[PDB]
């Protein structure tokens, strides 16, 4: 696709749940947990 000659290109790991952003993938992964715990039912649907 958008091939080229450029490396060392990190990404802005953003959360598609609340609206956060981290530097390292792990950081985000750990955060997401806050949204996913013990399958707490809610207004999610219905
Ligand atoms: Zn979040």
Swiss-Prot record:
Interacts with WT1. Interacts with DEPDC1A. This is Zinc finger protein 224. It is found in: Nucleus. May be involved in transcriptional regulation as a transcriptional repressor. The DEPDC1A-ZNF224 complex may play a critical role in bladder carcinogenesis by repressing the transcription of the A20 gene, leading to transport of NF-KB protein into the nucleus, resulting in suppression of apoptosis of bladder cancer cells. Ubiquitous. Mainly expressed in fetal tissues. Belongs to the krueppel C2H2-type zinc-finger protein family. It comes from Homo sapiens. It comes from the Eukaryota. A zinc finger (C2H2-type) spans 13-35.
């Amino acid at each position: 696709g958008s091939s080229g000659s450029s490396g060392m290109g990190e990404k802005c790991y953003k959360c598609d749940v609340c609206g956060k952003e981290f530097s390292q993938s792990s950081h985000l992964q750990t955060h997401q947990r806050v949204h996913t715990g013990e399958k707490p039912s809610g207004p999610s649907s219905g």
